[PDB]
Amino acid sequence: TDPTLEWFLSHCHIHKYPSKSTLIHQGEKAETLYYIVKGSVAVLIKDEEGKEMILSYLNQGDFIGELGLFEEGQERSAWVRAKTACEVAEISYKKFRQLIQVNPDILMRLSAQMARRLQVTSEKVGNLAFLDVTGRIAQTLLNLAKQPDAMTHPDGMQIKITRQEIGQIVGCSRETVGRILKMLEDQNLISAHGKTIVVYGT
Amino acid sequence: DPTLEWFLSHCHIHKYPSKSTLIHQGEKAETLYYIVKGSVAVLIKDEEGKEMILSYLNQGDFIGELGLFEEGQERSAWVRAKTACEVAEISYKKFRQLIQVNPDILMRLSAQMARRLQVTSEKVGNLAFLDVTGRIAQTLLNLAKQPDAMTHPDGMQIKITRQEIGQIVGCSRETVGRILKMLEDQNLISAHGKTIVVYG
Ligand SMILES: Nc1ncnc2c1ncn2[C@@H]1O[C@@H]2COP(=O)(O)O[C@H]2[C@H]1O
Ligand SMILES: Nc1ncnc2c1ncn2[C@@H]1O[C@@H]2COP(=O)(O)O[C@H]2[C@H]1O
Ligand SMILES: Nc1ncnc2c1ncn2[C@@H]1O[C@@H]2COP(=O)(O)O[C@H]2[C@H]1O
Structure with missing residues:
Protein backbone atom coordinates (compact mmCIF):
# COMPACT_ATOMS: atom_id res chain seq x y z
CA THR A 1 0.00 0.00 0.00
CA ASP A 2 1.69 3.18 -1.25
CA ASP A 132 37.15 -7.67 -25.53
CA VAL A 133 33.90 -9.42 -26.56
CA THR A 134 34.71 -12.36 -24.29
CA GLY A 135 35.03 -10.16 -21.19
CA ARG A 136 31.95 -8.19 -22.15
CA ILE A 137 29.99 -11.46 -22.12
CA ALA A 138 31.56 -12.54 -18.84
CA GLN A 139 30.51 -9.25 -17.21
CA THR A 140 27.01 -9.59 -18.68
CA LEU A 141 26.69 -12.95 -16.99
CA LEU A 142 28.05 -11.65 -13.73
CA ASN A 143 25.52 -8.83 -14.09
CA LEU A 144 22.37 -10.89 -14.58
CA ALA A 145 23.56 -12.95 -11.58
CA LYS A 146 23.76 -9.91 -9.27
CA GLN A 147 20.05 -9.49 -10.02
CA PRO A 148 16.92 -10.43 -8.00
CA ASP A 149 15.48 -12.98 -10.47
CA ALA A 150 18.72 -14.97 -10.25
CA MET A 151 18.06 -18.29 -8.47
CA THR A 152 20.68 -19.77 -6.15
CA HIS A 153 22.47 -22.92 -7.23
CA PRO A 154 25.06 -25.16 -5.57
CA ASP A 155 27.64 -24.06 -8.18
CA GLY A 156 26.95 -20.35 -8.55
CA MET A 157 23.92 -18.26 -9.41
CA GLN A 158 21.47 -19.67 -11.94
CA ILE A 159 20.09 -17.22 -14.54
CA LYS A 160 17.79 -17.72 -17.49
CA ILE A 161 18.47 -16.03 -20.79
CA THR A 162 18.67 -16.85 -24.51
CA ARG A 163 21.87 -16.46 -26.56
CA GLN A 164 20.03 -13.99 -28.77
CA GLU A 165 19.42 -11.70 -25.78
CA ILE A 166 22.98 -12.00 -24.48
CA GLY A 167 23.96 -10.88 -27.96
CA GLN A 168 21.64 -7.88 -27.93
CA ILE A 169 23.04 -6.75 -24.56
CA VAL A 170 26.81 -7.06 -25.17
CA GLY A 171 26.56 -6.13 -28.84
CA CYS A 172 27.27 -9.20 -31.01
CA SER A 173 26.06 -12.20 -33.05
CA ARG A 174 24.11 -14.89 -31.18
CA GLU A 175 26.29 -17.40 -33.02
CA THR A 176 29.24 -15.64 -31.39
CA VAL A 177 27.59 -15.90 -27.96
CA GLY A 178 27.20 -19.64 -28.50
CA ARG A 179 30.85 -20.26 -29.23
CA ILE A 180 32.00 -17.99 -26.40
CA LEU A 181 29.63 -19.59 -23.82
CA LYS A 182 30.98 -23.03 -24.72
CA MET A 183 34.49 -21.77 -24.18
CA LEU A 184 33.56 -20.24 -20.80
CA GLU A 185 32.28 -23.64 -19.77
CA ASP A 186 35.43 -25.52 -20.87
CA GLN A 187 37.14 -23.05 -18.54
CA ASN A 188 34.93 -24.07 -15.59
CA LEU A 189 33.30 -20.66 -15.25
CA ILE A 190 29.71 -21.60 -16.11
CA SER A 191 27.21 -24.38 -17.06
CA ALA A 192 24.86 -24.49 -20.04
CA HIS A 193 21.51 -26.27 -19.87
CA GLY A 194 20.18 -24.65 -23.02
CA LYS A 195 18.56 -21.40 -21.88
CA THR A 196 19.96 -21.78 -18.33
CA ILE A 197 23.41 -20.60 -17.39
CA VAL A 198 24.91 -21.28 -13.96
CA VAL A 199 27.43 -18.52 -13.39
CA TYR A 200 30.05 -20.01 -11.05
CA GLY A 201 31.30 -17.65 -8.36
CA THR A 202 34.85 -17.97 -9.69
CA ASP B 1 18.51 33.63 -12.08
CA ASP B 131 35.33 1.11 -34.99
CA VAL B 132 37.96 3.17 -33.18
CA THR B 133 38.42 4.92 -36.53
CA GLY B 134 34.82 6.10 -36.94
CA ARG B 135 34.76 7.24 -33.28
CA ILE B 136 37.88 9.39 -33.57
CA ALA B 137 36.06 10.85 -36.58
CA GLN B 138 32.91 11.11 -34.49
CA THR B 139 34.87 12.94 -31.77
CA LEU B 140 36.80 15.47 -33.86
CA LEU B 141 33.57 16.67 -35.48
CA ASN B 142 31.91 17.01 -32.06
CA LEU B 143 34.94 18.98 -30.80
CA ALA B 144 34.44 21.45 -33.63
CA LYS B 145 30.78 21.90 -32.66
CA GLN B 146 31.69 22.50 -29.01
CA PRO B 147 32.40 26.07 -27.76
CA ASP B 148 36.18 26.30 -27.33
CA ALA B 149 36.62 25.44 -31.04
CA MET B 150 38.67 28.19 -32.71
CA THR B 151 38.05 29.45 -36.25
CA HIS B 152 40.46 28.52 -39.04
CA PRO B 153 40.38 29.41 -42.74
CA ASP B 154 40.01 25.70 -43.60
CA GLY B 155 37.99 24.57 -40.59
CA MET B 156 37.55 24.77 -36.82
CA GLN B 157 41.03 24.30 -35.34
CA ILE B 158 40.63 22.30 -32.10
CA LYS B 159 43.31 21.53 -29.50
CA ILE B 160 43.66 18.18 -27.69
CA THR B 161 46.52 15.81 -26.88
CA ARG B 162 46.39 12.44 -28.63
CA GLN B 163 45.91 10.60 -25.34
CA GLU B 164 42.90 12.69 -24.40
CA ILE B 165 41.27 11.56 -27.66
CA GLY B 166 41.86 7.97 -26.61
CA GLN B 167 40.51 8.54 -23.14
CA ILE B 168 37.40 9.60 -25.03
CA VAL B 169 37.10 7.01 -27.82
CA GLY B 170 38.63 4.25 -25.74
CA CYS B 171 41.86 3.39 -27.57
CA SER B 172 45.59 3.69 -26.91
CA ARG B 173 47.67 6.83 -27.59
CA GLU B 174 49.38 5.06 -30.51
CA THR B 175 46.15 3.92 -32.09
CA VAL B 176 45.20 7.60 -32.12
CA GLY B 177 48.43 8.58 -33.88
CA ARG B 178 47.82 5.96 -36.59
CA ILE B 179 44.16 6.91 -37.11
CA LEU B 180 44.89 10.65 -37.27
CA LYS B 181 47.53 9.79 -39.87
CA MET B 182 44.92 8.01 -42.06
CA LEU B 183 42.64 11.00 -41.52
CA GLU B 184 45.36 13.41 -42.54
CA ASP B 185 46.11 11.26 -45.61
CA GLN B 186 42.47 11.36 -46.72
CA ASN B 187 42.76 15.11 -46.39
CA LEU B 188 40.17 15.31 -43.61
CA ILE B 189 42.23 17.09 -40.94
CA SER B 190 45.57 18.75 -40.30
CA ALA B 191 47.92 18.28 -37.37
CA HIS B 192 50.77 20.60 -36.37
CA GLY B 193 52.16 20.97 -32.87
CA LYS B 194 49.28 19.45 -30.99
CA THR B 195 46.33 21.24 -32.57
CA ILE B 196 43.89 19.80 -35.10
CA VAL B 197 42.41 21.53 -38.12
CA VAL B 198 39.35 19.44 -38.80
CA TYR B 199 38.25 20.47 -42.28
CA GLY B 200 34.79 22.03 -42.47
N1 LIG C 1 20.31 4.00 -20.99
C1 LIG C 1 19.01 3.80 -20.66
N2 LIG C 1 18.68 3.02 -19.56
C2 LIG C 1 17.38 2.84 -19.27
N3 LIG C 1 16.29 3.33 -19.90
C3 LIG C 1 16.65 4.12 -21.00
C4 LIG C 1 17.96 4.38 -21.43
N4 LIG C 1 17.97 5.19 -22.55
C5 LIG C 1 16.70 5.41 -22.78
N5 LIG C 1 15.81 4.79 -21.89
C6 LIG C 1 14.32 4.87 -21.89
O1 LIG C 1 13.86 4.83 -23.27
C7 LIG C 1 12.78 5.72 -23.28
C8 LIG C 1 12.25 6.14 -24.69
O2 LIG C 1 12.08 7.60 -24.94
P1 LIG C 1 12.44 8.83 -23.85
O3 LIG C 1 13.73 9.44 -24.32
O4 LIG C 1 11.23 9.69 -23.82
O5 LIG C 1 12.58 8.04 -22.47
C9 LIG C 1 13.39 6.88 -22.57
C10 LIG C 1 13.90 6.25 -21.37
O6 LIG C 1 12.87 6.05 -20.41
N1 LIG D 1 27.73 9.30 -17.60
C1 LIG D 1 27.86 10.45 -16.92
N2 LIG D 1 27.64 11.66 -17.53
C2 LIG D 1 27.79 12.79 -16.80
N3 LIG D 1 28.12 12.92 -15.50
C3 LIG D 1 28.33 11.67 -14.93
C4 LIG D 1 28.22 10.44 -15.55
N4 LIG D 1 28.49 9.40 -14.68
C5 LIG D 1 28.75 10.02 -13.57
N5 LIG D 1 28.67 11.41 -13.63
C6 LIG D 1 28.88 12.36 -12.53
O1 LIG D 1 30.02 11.90 -11.79
C7 LIG D 1 29.68 12.10 -10.45
C8 LIG D 1 30.54 11.31 -9.44
O2 LIG D 1 29.80 10.65 -8.34
P1 LIG D 1 28.16 10.68 -8.10
O3 LIG D 1 27.69 9.30 -8.38
O4 LIG D 1 28.02 11.21 -6.74
O5 LIG D 1 27.63 11.74 -9.16
C9 LIG D 1 28.27 11.63 -10.42
C10 LIG D 1 27.69 12.27 -11.58
O6 LIG D 1 27.27 13.58 -11.28
N1 LIG E 1 40.71 0.16 -24.30
C1 LIG E 1 41.69 1.02 -24.04
N2 LIG E 1 42.99 0.69 -24.34
C2 LIG E 1 43.97 1.59 -24.06
N3 LIG E 1 43.85 2.81 -23.51
C3 LIG E 1 42.51 3.11 -23.22
C4 LIG E 1 41.41 2.29 -23.45
N4 LIG E 1 40.23 2.90 -23.04
C5 LIG E 1 40.63 4.06 -22.58
N5 LIG E 1 42.00 4.28 -22.64
C6 LIG E 1 42.76 5.49 -22.20
O1 LIG E 1 42.99 6.26 -23.39
C7 LIG E 1 44.25 6.85 -23.25
C8 LIG E 1 44.96 7.21 -24.58
O2 LIG E 1 46.43 7.14 -24.56
P1 LIG E 1 47.38 6.71 -23.24
O3 LIG E 1 48.18 5.53 -23.68
O4 LIG E 1 48.08 7.97 -22.91
O5 LIG E 1 46.32 6.36 -22.07
C9 LIG E 1 45.07 5.82 -22.53
C10 LIG E 1 44.13 5.20 -21.57
O6 LIG E 1 44.19 5.79 -20.29
Missing part, protein backbone atom coordinates in the same frame (compact mmCIF):
# COMPACT_ATOMS: atom_id res chain seq x y z
CA PRO A 3 -0.39 6.42 -0.94
CA THR A 4 1.92 8.33 -3.32
CA LEU A 5 1.78 5.78 -6.14
CA GLU A 6 -1.95 5.31 -5.72
CA TRP A 7 -2.25 9.10 -5.81
CA PHE A 8 -0.01 9.20 -8.90
CA LEU A 9 -1.78 6.34 -10.72
CA SER A 10 -5.21 7.94 -10.09
CA HIS A 11 -4.13 10.66 -12.54
CA CYS A 12 -3.07 8.16 -15.21
CA HIS A 13 -5.21 6.24 -17.65
CA ILE A 14 -3.84 2.68 -17.45
CA HIS A 15 -3.32 0.45 -20.49
CA LYS A 16 -2.51 -3.18 -21.25
CA TYR A 17 -0.06 -3.91 -24.08
CA PRO A 18 0.45 -7.51 -25.30
CA SER A 19 3.90 -9.08 -25.27
CA LYS A 20 6.21 -7.81 -28.04
CA SER A 21 4.27 -4.60 -28.80
CA THR A 22 6.28 -1.37 -29.06
CA LEU A 23 5.23 1.07 -26.32
CA ILE A 24 7.66 3.85 -27.30
CA HIS A 25 8.84 4.54 -30.82
CA GLN A 26 12.24 6.27 -31.20
CA GLY A 27 12.18 9.67 -32.89
CA GLU A 28 8.60 10.42 -31.89
CA LYS A 29 7.99 13.68 -30.05
CA ALA A 30 8.30 13.38 -26.28
CA GLU A 31 5.14 14.62 -24.54
CA THR A 32 3.90 11.73 -22.37
CA LEU A 33 5.17 9.79 -19.36
CA TYR A 34 4.69 6.09 -18.65
CA TYR A 35 4.70 3.82 -15.62
CA ILE A 36 4.76 0.00 -15.62
CA VAL A 37 2.13 -1.32 -13.22
CA LYS A 38 2.61 -4.85 -14.61
CA GLY A 39 5.20 -6.37 -16.91
CA SER A 40 8.73 -6.04 -18.21
CA VAL A 41 10.13 -4.15 -21.18
CA ALA A 42 13.33 -3.78 -23.13
CA VAL A 43 14.85 -0.41 -24.01
CA LEU A 44 16.90 -0.63 -27.15
CA ILE A 45 18.57 1.21 -29.99
CA LYS A 46 19.09 0.06 -33.60
CA ASP A 47 22.33 -0.07 -35.63
CA GLU A 48 22.87 1.35 -39.15
CA GLU A 49 22.42 -2.23 -40.36
CA GLY A 50 19.24 -2.91 -38.37
CA LYS A 51 21.05 -4.55 -35.45
CA GLU A 52 19.28 -3.97 -32.11
CA MET A 53 21.07 -3.33 -28.85
CA ILE A 54 19.36 -3.66 -25.47
CA LEU A 55 20.39 -0.66 -23.38
CA SER A 56 18.31 -1.81 -20.47
CA TYR A 57 15.53 -4.01 -19.18
CA LEU A 58 12.85 -2.18 -17.18
CA ASN A 59 10.26 -3.88 -14.99
CA GLN A 60 7.19 -3.29 -12.88
CA GLY A 61 7.58 -0.12 -10.83
CA ASP A 62 9.67 1.70 -13.47
CA PHE A 63 8.90 4.97 -15.23
CA ILE A 64 9.20 5.06 -19.03
CA GLY A 65 9.70 7.85 -21.54
CA GLU A 66 10.76 10.39 -18.88
CA LEU A 67 13.73 11.82 -20.75
CA GLY A 68 11.73 14.42 -22.67
CA LEU A 69 9.93 15.60 -19.52
CA PHE A 70 12.14 18.56 -18.72
CA GLU A 71 12.12 20.23 -22.15
CA GLU A 72 9.92 20.23 -25.24
CA GLY A 73 10.79 19.42 -28.83
CA GLN A 74 12.51 16.36 -27.42
CA GLU A 75 12.25 13.03 -29.23
CA ARG A 76 12.07 9.57 -27.65
CA SER A 77 15.74 8.58 -27.54
CA ALA A 78 15.13 4.84 -27.91
CA TRP A 79 12.69 2.05 -28.59
CA VAL A 80 10.72 0.40 -25.80
CA ARG A 81 8.93 -2.90 -26.51
CA ALA A 82 6.86 -5.11 -24.26
CA LYS A 83 8.97 -8.16 -23.34
CA THR A 84 5.95 -9.76 -21.66
CA ALA A 85 2.43 -8.33 -21.72
CA CYS A 86 2.39 -5.03 -19.79
CA GLU A 87 -0.04 -2.92 -17.77
CA VAL A 88 1.17 0.65 -18.31
CA ALA A 89 -0.06 3.92 -16.72
CA GLU A 90 0.05 7.08 -18.86
CA ILE A 91 -0.06 10.80 -18.02
CA SER A 92 0.83 13.96 -19.97
CA TYR A 93 4.11 15.69 -19.15
CA LYS A 94 2.21 18.85 -18.26
CA LYS A 95 -0.23 17.05 -15.93
CA PHE A 96 2.82 15.41 -14.35
CA ARG A 97 4.46 18.80 -13.70
CA GLN A 98 1.43 19.92 -11.61
CA LEU A 99 1.66 16.79 -9.45
CA ILE A 100 5.27 17.72 -8.80
CA GLN A 101 4.24 20.98 -7.06
CA VAL A 102 1.73 19.16 -4.84
CA ASN A 103 4.22 16.41 -3.92
CA PRO A 104 7.69 16.36 -5.51
CA ASP A 105 8.41 12.95 -3.98
CA ILE A 106 6.89 11.50 -7.18
CA LEU A 107 9.77 13.18 -9.02
CA MET A 108 12.36 11.97 -6.51
CA ARG A 109 11.21 8.49 -7.38
CA LEU A 110 11.38 9.21 -11.10
CA SER A 111 14.84 10.82 -10.78
CA ALA A 112 16.06 8.07 -8.47
CA GLN A 113 15.45 5.74 -11.44
CA MET A 114 17.21 8.13 -13.86
CA ALA A 115 20.05 8.12 -11.33
CA ARG A 116 20.38 4.35 -11.49
CA ARG A 117 20.06 4.08 -15.26
CA LEU A 118 22.89 6.57 -15.63
CA GLN A 119 25.18 4.56 -13.34
CA VAL A 120 24.52 1.30 -15.22
CA THR A 121 24.66 2.78 -18.69
CA SER A 122 28.00 4.21 -17.60
CA GLU A 123 29.33 0.77 -16.69
CA LYS A 124 28.36 -0.35 -20.18
CA VAL A 125 30.49 2.43 -21.62
CA GLY A 126 33.34 1.12 -19.48
CA ASN A 127 32.82 -2.49 -20.53
CA LEU A 128 32.50 -1.50 -24.23
CA ALA A 129 35.76 0.44 -24.11
CA PHE A 130 37.86 -1.74 -21.81
CA LEU A 131 36.82 -5.32 -22.57
CA PRO B 2 16.22 33.68 -8.97
CA THR B 3 16.18 29.96 -8.32
CA LEU B 4 19.92 29.41 -8.87
CA GLU B 5 20.82 32.39 -6.71
CA TRP B 6 18.42 31.18 -4.00
CA PHE B 7 19.98 27.73 -4.26
CA LEU B 8 23.53 29.12 -4.13
CA SER B 9 22.65 31.13 -1.02
CA HIS B 10 22.52 27.83 0.91
CA CYS B 11 25.72 26.36 -0.48
CA HIS B 12 29.24 26.73 0.81
CA ILE B 13 31.51 27.60 -2.11
CA HIS B 14 34.99 26.22 -2.64
CA LYS B 15 37.70 26.76 -5.22
CA TYR B 16 39.61 23.82 -6.64
CA PRO B 17 42.90 24.25 -8.47
CA SER B 18 43.38 22.67 -11.88
CA LYS B 19 44.13 18.90 -11.76
CA SER B 20 42.46 18.52 -8.38
CA THR B 21 40.07 15.62 -7.72
CA LEU B 22 36.65 16.88 -6.52
CA ILE B 23 35.09 13.42 -6.27
CA HIS B 24 36.77 10.03 -5.83
CA GLN B 25 35.07 6.89 -7.10
CA GLY B 26 33.96 4.75 -4.19
CA GLU B 27 33.53 7.55 -1.64
CA LYS B 28 30.31 7.84 0.38
CA ALA B 29 27.94 10.30 -1.23
CA GLU B 30 26.26 12.94 0.93
CA THR B 31 27.07 16.18 -0.88
CA LEU B 32 25.65 17.87 -3.99
CA TYR B 33 27.86 20.10 -6.12
CA TYR B 34 27.19 22.94 -8.52
CA ILE B 35 29.95 24.31 -10.77
CA VAL B 36 29.86 28.11 -10.69
CA LYS B 37 33.21 28.49 -12.46
CA GLY B 38 35.38 26.15 -14.50
CA SER B 39 35.04 22.74 -16.08
CA VAL B 40 35.72 19.18 -14.94
CA ALA B 41 36.32 15.69 -16.35
CA VAL B 42 34.05 12.87 -15.20
CA LEU B 43 35.86 9.60 -15.84
CA ILE B 44 36.19 5.88 -15.06
CA LYS B 45 39.14 3.51 -14.87
CA ASP B 46 40.27 0.05 -15.96
CA GLU B 47 41.14 -2.81 -13.58
CA GLU B 48 44.61 -1.99 -14.93
CA GLY B 49 44.48 1.81 -14.67
CA LYS B 50 43.40 3.00 -18.13
CA GLU B 51 40.97 5.96 -18.13
CA MET B 52 37.71 6.70 -19.93
CA ILE B 53 36.15 10.18 -20.00
CA LEU B 54 32.40 9.72 -19.59
CA SER B 55 31.66 13.41 -19.88
CA TYR B 56 32.92 16.90 -19.37
CA LEU B 57 30.96 19.24 -17.15
CA ASN B 58 30.90 22.98 -17.09
CA GLN B 59 29.66 26.17 -15.45
CA GLY B 60 26.09 25.53 -14.38
CA ASP B 61 26.32 21.73 -14.09
CA PHE B 62 25.47 19.80 -10.97
CA ILE B 63 27.95 17.17 -9.93
CA GLY B 64 27.64 14.24 -7.54
CA GLU B 65 23.85 13.92 -7.72
CA LEU B 66 23.64 10.16 -8.24
CA GLY B 67 23.65 9.27 -4.54
CA LEU B 68 20.95 11.85 -3.72
CA PHE B 69 17.88 9.70 -4.19
CA GLU B 70 18.96 6.89 -1.89
CA GLU B 71 21.41 6.28 0.91
CA GLY B 72 24.54 4.23 1.42
CA GLN B 73 25.34 5.32 -2.12
CA GLU B 74 28.97 5.57 -3.19
CA ARG B 75 30.51 7.93 -5.75
CA SER B 76 30.23 6.26 -9.16
CA ALA B 77 33.13 8.10 -10.89
CA TRP B 78 36.15 10.37 -10.36
CA VAL B 79 35.65 14.09 -11.09
CA ARG B 80 38.70 16.22 -11.73
CA ALA B 81 39.11 19.94 -12.29
CA LYS B 82 40.06 20.38 -15.94
CA THR B 83 40.67 24.07 -15.17
CA ALA B 84 40.41 26.32 -12.13
CA CYS B 85 37.01 25.77 -10.45
CA GLU B 86 34.52 27.45 -8.19
CA VAL B 87 32.20 24.76 -6.87
CA ALA B 88 29.10 25.32 -4.76
CA GLU B 89 28.56 22.56 -2.23
CA ILE B 90 25.70 21.31 -0.03
CA SER B 91 24.55 18.27 1.95
CA TYR B 92 21.82 16.10 0.47
CA LYS B 93 20.06 16.60 3.81
CA LYS B 94 19.92 20.37 3.31
CA PHE B 95 19.14 19.93 -0.39
CA ARG B 96 16.12 17.71 0.30
CA GLN B 97 14.62 20.58 2.32
CA LEU B 98 15.21 22.97 -0.58
CA ILE B 99 13.33 20.57 -2.85
CA GLN B 100 10.28 20.73 -0.50
CA VAL B 101 10.38 24.55 -0.32
CA ASN B 102 10.61 24.81 -4.13
CA PRO B 103 10.71 21.72 -6.42
CA ASP B 104 11.84 23.80 -9.40
CA ILE B 105 15.36 23.30 -8.12
CA LEU B 106 14.85 19.54 -8.52
CA MET B 107 13.50 19.97 -12.04
CA ARG B 108 16.74 21.80 -12.92
CA LEU B 109 18.74 18.91 -11.52
CA SER B 110 16.51 16.28 -13.06
CA ALA B 111 16.72 18.04 -16.43
CA GLN B 112 20.51 17.56 -16.44
CA MET B 113 20.26 13.91 -15.49
CA ALA B 114 17.86 13.30 -18.33
CA ARG B 115 20.37 14.85 -20.74
CA ARG B 116 23.34 12.86 -19.36
CA LEU B 117 21.36 9.64 -19.74
CA GLN B 118 20.45 10.46 -23.34
CA VAL B 119 24.07 11.36 -24.04
CA THR B 120 25.72 8.40 -22.33
CA SER B 121 23.21 6.16 -24.10
CA GLU B 122 24.40 7.76 -27.32
CA LYS B 123 27.93 6.91 -26.19
CA VAL B 124 26.99 3.26 -25.65
CA GLY B 125 25.67 3.28 -29.21
CA ASN B 126 28.90 4.75 -30.64
CA LEU B 127 31.15 2.27 -28.86
CA ALA B 128 29.07 -0.73 -29.88
CA PHE B 129 28.53 0.27 -33.52
CA LEU B 130 31.70 2.21 -34.57
